[PDB]
């Protein structure tokens, strides 16, 4: 892939990892952050979908 | 807010900022990352919704 695509792929990997870390933190606050943990769950799945879409488009090459 | 809520709010702010940076990068690659830029657009809006939900729940106090 190009260098510019590699930066974007690396950034998508990082965001997926940070949204998982934040989901864990919101889940640890239990009832105090319940709605927020539910939104973040969907955010993490959305981050994972973006990362896999970038890997598929820019990789194997 | 508590210290634990402040960590989660700060993390949600950071993720919102990183998803905007990644959206700009994917938009700069134009047709080469078009589907990915469309997914990331929705990701950034989702990140913004999470941050505003955390600010509303944990703030003004």
UniProtKB/Swiss-Prot annotation, chains A, B:
Domain of life the protein comes from: Bacteria
Keyword match Cytoplasm: no
One of the record's GO molecular function terms: identical protein binding
Keyword entries, A-Z: Plasmid, Transcription, Transcription regulation
SUBUNIT field: Antiparallel homodimer.
Function: Regulates plasmid DNA replication by modulating the initiation of transcription of the primer RNA precursor. Processing of the precursor of the primer, RNAII, is inhibited by hydrogen bonding of RNAII to its complementary sequence in RNAI. ROP increases the affinity of RNAI for RNAII and thus decreases the rate of replication initiation events.
Protein name listed in UniProt: Regulatory protein rop
Organism field: Escherichia coli
């Amino acid at each position: 892939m190009t260098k510019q695509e590699k930066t974007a792929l690396n950034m998508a990997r990082f965001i997926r990892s940070q949204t998982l870390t934040l989901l864990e933190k919101l889940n640890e606050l239990a009832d105090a952050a319940d709605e927020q943990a539910d939104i973040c769950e969907s955010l993490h799945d959305h981050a994972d979908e973006l990362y896999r879409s970038c890997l598929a488009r820019f990789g194997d090459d």
